[PDB]
Amino acid sequence: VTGSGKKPWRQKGTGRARSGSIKSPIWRSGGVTFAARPQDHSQKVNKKMYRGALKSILSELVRQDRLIVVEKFSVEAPKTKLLAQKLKDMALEDVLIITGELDENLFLAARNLHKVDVRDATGIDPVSLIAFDKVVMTADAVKQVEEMLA
Amino acid sequence: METIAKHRHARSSAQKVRLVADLIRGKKVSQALDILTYTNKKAAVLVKKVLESAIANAEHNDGADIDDLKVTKIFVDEGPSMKRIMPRAKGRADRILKRTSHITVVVSDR
């Protein structure tokens, strides 16, 4: 706190409560007894506890019919409207797409669709697999996810 | 037909205006003014203008007949205190409040 460390007024004789610093945290201005620092909130996860966890969630997806397997999943031209048509046709709306390779057209077409996300198998994460109503995987995508968890 | 007049921010403490306000509460307006005219108080001057303002409000806007009016409600409220400083001995400073008052007067023919 900015200011000086002159005693505001003596250890004795004045009728007031004893003071030492105008920046005492009881004082108006310059409080904050236990001020914050920038800090690292990250936690360790065991390699095995992470993989074990991915497998449990994925296994539930199957059981709840939220996991959808297909031979191929791609789009022609990079037009979100094109994708939109396809998704309605598949009766899908709130969905995560995981493909075999980072397909770019598919990637571009999905960016403005809020209820849709596209992902290559390598880039998957735990919360995305949960955060969507349905999840779509290519045949190729399965083989890559399988090898990864094994 | 209640009719209001007010002096807001009058330069007198509420306490002092109240002694005079009390002399006319419930009275005929004609009877009230005479009482006020011969009350030897600064506060007699302040409220009388207000009562007379109230009388004029009654004739000009609607009511009228000076005969029928009574002082049916009157109250004096506290205004803002102006904060000032008075030097006392040995470098000590005291507050003075220059107190003010909100003077409200109500009249009606009924």
Binding site: W9, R10, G13, T14 | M82, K83, R84, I85, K90, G91, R92, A93
Partner: peptide, 26 residues
């Protein structure tokens, strides 16, 4: 206006001792 603010106020502080009078006194 009616600024209504003449006073600083910046009220003064006296110190310290004028009177030290006894006694107990020992």
């Amino acid at each position: 206006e009616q600024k209504l603010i003449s006073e600083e106020d910046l009220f003064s502080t006296p110190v310290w001792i004028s009177q030290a009078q006894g006694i107990r006194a020992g």
